Amino acid sequence: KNQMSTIAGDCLLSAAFIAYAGYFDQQMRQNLFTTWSHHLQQANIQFRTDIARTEYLSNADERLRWQASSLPADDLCTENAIMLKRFNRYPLIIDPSGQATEFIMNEYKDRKITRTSFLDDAFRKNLESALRFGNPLLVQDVESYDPVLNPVLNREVRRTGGRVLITLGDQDIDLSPSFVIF
């Protein structure tokens, strides 16, 4: 009941944390969260002062799942694993480790996922075949960026009917809560 009475500031700040503060490190993430919390307290909304993002937004079930998985015991990567699911639009993973690839191709098996990248030879037609099929990908190393997947990243509005979704270039598209590309 108190959670309904003071859901405003807390859930607004958690959602704003997912949306805006994804590029920044732990220091700037916490600085943004604390400045937002202080201003919300100044906005006559008296909430839980001691809130962490991994204990508010996510649950200990998926926390233990990621701890017992191949993900290491580190708060930044557990928080980013939470961010891997609570997103809306197609993100990028700016990483020097590249360990998200084994995560994606290990927990993505039933969709018959394919290993695709940017600098490989299997990109001038494998991207088009993946668009035709409708399967998720984790193409990496964006330094030779393909401008043909900008409609995919843009998610244009074109309604004609309903089928398995894919945001193609010159073909009709549909809507479904199934496919997302990384």
């Binding site: 001038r124 401008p147 043909v148 900008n150 509005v157 010159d170």
Partner: protein
């Protein structure tokens, strides 16, 4: 519509507006100011067949009405109408209705571009042509596209909202073709 729109700063817009008032009162003597100029100096060929001065209440009623009829037509995402998008829609329609109109919209990404234009082209009966980009996109394909749209505009007597992005302007030699086209 020519000068105050293009300026970045609201202070610059205010200075331009007050000097418009100053020059109008300076070189338009013995004319009442309240009828010579006002705050909502807006024109459209929809309230009547003449560009009669339009007041805030009726233009806002019109903009709510057109958005209300556009709700179920194409856009499943609710377009939000306000003081700037209303002005930009009327500016873009004035430029479309003007002969040899050619508008350079300078602004941040997203924010209303290529959705205001698509919406206005849908409600004004115009056609929409967009350029796809593949690898080895030579200028010959663009020249063929320009030939077909020019013959559609002139030979087939059809007003065209020819829209282009920053993804199909990567090459250099064909950029100045639009210069002499203008």
């Amino acid at each position: 519509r020519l000068f105050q729109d293009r300026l970045v700063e609201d202070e610059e817009r205010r200075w331009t507006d007050e000097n418009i008032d100053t020059v109008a009162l300076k070189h338009f003597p013995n004319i009442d100011r309240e009828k010579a100029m006002s705050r909502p100096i807006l024109y459209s060929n929809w309230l009547s067949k003449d560009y009669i001065p339009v007041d805030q209440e009726e233009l806002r009623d019109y903009v709510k009405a057109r958005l209300k009829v556009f709700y179920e037509e194409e856009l499943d995402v609710p377009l939000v109408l306000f003081n700037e998008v209303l002005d930009h829609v009327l500016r873009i329609d004035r430029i479309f209705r003007q002969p040899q109109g050619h508008l350079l919209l300078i602004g941040v990404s997203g924010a209303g571009k290529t959705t205001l234009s698509r919406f206005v082209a849908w409600m004004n009966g115009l056609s929409v042509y967009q350029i796809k980009v593949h690898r080895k996109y030579t200028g010959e394909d663009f020249d063929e596209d320009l030939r077909t749209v020019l013959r559609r505009s002139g030979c087939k007597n059809e007003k065209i909202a020819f829209i282009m992005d920053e993804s199909n302007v990567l090459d250099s030699g064909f950029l100045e073709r639009m210069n002499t086209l203008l």
